[PDB]
């Protein structure tokens, strides 16, 4: 009888609750919401973050980060998505990915794993794109797992391991750093105009080692700019950063009179400005919890080197600003550090005059309840930069909620051109 | 406080007061409909107003919304054609499953 | 026992909901005025399924 061809703008409420938990230094999705082209989106999240109960009182605060991204479906499917919308009703169904059989094999995607073992691929593919563009180190290779079932238990359960806060050892110079550059002069002659050309080519190589390892960085150096559709990267909408604090509880019985237990409870807000959605896609929110990288057995570089030369100590501007980067070992910074090839990296020529490390007294070593890196970070450069959550197990009491937990309410309001429920159920 | 305005009683009878206590219906193993269906067609995802407002109600199963949900006749019911674009469910992490002290519908 | 707060599964469409409605057209012909009458009777049935059961 009466065929409907259009719809008014209606206020849709997409608010819901979230019960979240995770580990230290792993990225995990906490909320998502699919969107349609032409929508007007707004988000506001309010909740409280908690850590597991501590073995002692409060010593060090933790840092919490919240992120929101928008990913069009065209970035995930490509040409398949283009033909999908042009065909219309008789379009081919989109491809899928395979998941595991347990209930928690997709916890990093913020959803319960369906019993069928099959789910759409836009959440898994959007997670990889975010990680490879914003969170991993620029010099390490991308993650290219095809299906969620290809991950190990740790990655699927809690998320991918992220990088420590920047220090001398956790933010070294990239591995493709050269300390020498050779030329092909003659046996008894040299071209000096050719020498000038050699320095010019070395300058462009050093630019791409320190600043420009991505395509959008190269364009930015010329003074241009690239849209997020040019390099197929997710669009960041909002970032929030805050510190979590709490209070202490005192024991009052015979045995525990004089000891204390700390609990962390912090309220937060994550507000995203109004956004106009240009195409069909998804909007995802993620969280990250980290501690400042304090190590017990770390000392000053001048203390660790022992025998000091004029270059080390004088701080002469002519020598500091004209020498190639120096290669140092982990032994020079940590007790029992290594000397082999895997314990070697390169730093600035006088970096020790621009920072001072933190000191932990030997009375605090091997003491439960203090969030510390006991000893030194182990492994090669890749394992040294990435955070390992199992090293923080000595700070918390064993519980089923991991190392941190939160409860938040996401206030989502969208203006959508969709027919009402009454229109959908009445034939005439 | 429960205050009732003044009332004129027209005939013999009784006046009764009752109480009801409920929790919001949050289930641990519940997921989005688009996640549970898996293979998505143009009708499911495009949100085209012509198709949304002119199609008969769709029948879905409990499997499409809950883990280990059923498929038989007793686990089937009917919803609006694009109801999943008008609401979003709550998420409970797997660490909270089978944990005493949280008012939840387990499963 | 009372009912849960309204959700997608706790507030479904009533069990007397039809997804089809048949007519008795001819073998090679159809009355189109009769077709208009069929839609009118379907509208009153859907009113009593969704809104007016009391």
């Amino acid at each position: 009888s009466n065929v409907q061809t259009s719809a008014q703008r209606d206020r849709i409420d997409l608010s819901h609750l979230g019960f979240l938990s995770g580990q230290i230094g792993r990225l995990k999705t906490v909320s998502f919401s699919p969107v349609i082209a032409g929508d007007s989106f707004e988000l506001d999240a309010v909740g409280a973050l908690r850590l597991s109960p501590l073995r002692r009182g409060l010593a060090i605060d933790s840092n919490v980060d919240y992120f929101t991204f928008y990913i069009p479906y065209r970035h995930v499917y490509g040409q398949t998505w283009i033909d999908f919308m042009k065909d219309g009703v008789n379009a081919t169904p989109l491809p899928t990915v395979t998941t595991g059989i347990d209930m928690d094999q997709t916890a990093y995607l913020g959803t319960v794993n369906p019993t069928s073992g099959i789910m759409p691929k836009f959440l898994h593919q959007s997670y990889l794109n975010i990680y490879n563009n914003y969170f991993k180190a620029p010099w390490m290779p991308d993650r290219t797992e095809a299906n969620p079932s290809n991950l190990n238990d740790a990655d699927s359960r809690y998320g991918f391991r992220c990088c420590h806060l920047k220090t001398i050892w956790s933010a070294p110079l990239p591995p493709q750093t050269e300390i020498a550059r050779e030329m092909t002069t003659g046996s008894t002659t040299i071209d000096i105009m050719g020498l000038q050309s050699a320095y010019a080519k070395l300058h462009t190589d050093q630019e791409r080692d320190y600043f420009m390892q991505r395509y959008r960085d190269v364009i930015s150096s010329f003074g241009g700019k690239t849209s997020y559709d040019a390099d197929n990267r997710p669009l960041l909408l909002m970032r929030s950063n805050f510190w979590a604090s709490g209070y202490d509880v005192d024991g009052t019985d015979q045995t525990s009179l004089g000891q204390f237990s700390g609990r962390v409870q912090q309220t937060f807000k994550h507000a995203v400005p109004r956004f106009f959605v240009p195409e069909h896609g998804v909007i995802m929110t993620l969280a990250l919890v980290r501690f400042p990288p304090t190590c017990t057995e770390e000392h000053h570089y001048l203390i660790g080197k022992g025998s000091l030369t004029y270059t080390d100590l004088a701080g002469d501007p002519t020598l500091v600003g004209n020498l190639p980067p120096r290669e140092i070992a982990m032994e020079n910074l940590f007790r029992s550090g290594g000397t082999g090839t895997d314990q070697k990296f390169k730093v600035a020529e006088s970096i020790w005059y621009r920072y001072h490390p933190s000191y932990v007294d030997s009375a605090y070593h091997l003491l439960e309840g203090f969030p510390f890196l006991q000893g030194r970070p182990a492994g090669n450069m890749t394992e040294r930069v990435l955070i390992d959550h199992t090293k923080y197990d000595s700070c918390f009491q064993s519980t089923q909620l991991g190392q941190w937990n939160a409860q938040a309410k996401f206030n989502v309001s969208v203006y959508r051109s969709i027919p009402t429920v009454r229109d959908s159920i009445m034939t005439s | 406080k429960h205050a009732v305005p003044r009332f004129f009683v027209p005939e013999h009878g009784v006046i009764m007061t009752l109480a009801l206590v409920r929790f919001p219906p949050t289930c641990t193993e519940e997921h989005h409909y688009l996640i549970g269906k898996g293979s998505l067609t143009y009708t499911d995802l495009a949100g085209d107003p012509t198709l949304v407002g002119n199609l008969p109600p769709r029948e879905i199963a409990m499997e499409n919304l809950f883990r280990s949900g059923g498929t038989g006749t007793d686990q089937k019911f009917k919803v609006a054609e694009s109801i999943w674009y008008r609401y979003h469910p709550s998420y409970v992490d797997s660490a909270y499953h089978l944990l005493e002290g949280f008012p939840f519908l387990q499963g | 026992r009372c009912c849960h707060l309204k959700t997608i599964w706790s507030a479904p469409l009533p069990p007397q909901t039809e997804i089809a409605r048949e007519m008795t057209t001819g073998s090679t012909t159809i009355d189109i005025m009769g077709l208009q009458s069929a839609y009118a009777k379907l509208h009153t049935d859907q009113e009593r399924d969704y809104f007016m059961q009391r």
Partner: peptide
Amino acid sequence: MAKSYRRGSSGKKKGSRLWYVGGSQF
């Protein structure tokens, strides 16, 4: 100690009706 994220399961309803069960239900 916690109002918004402990009271209710969603946001305020300012829009079209979503549920039709055949009449009033409480």
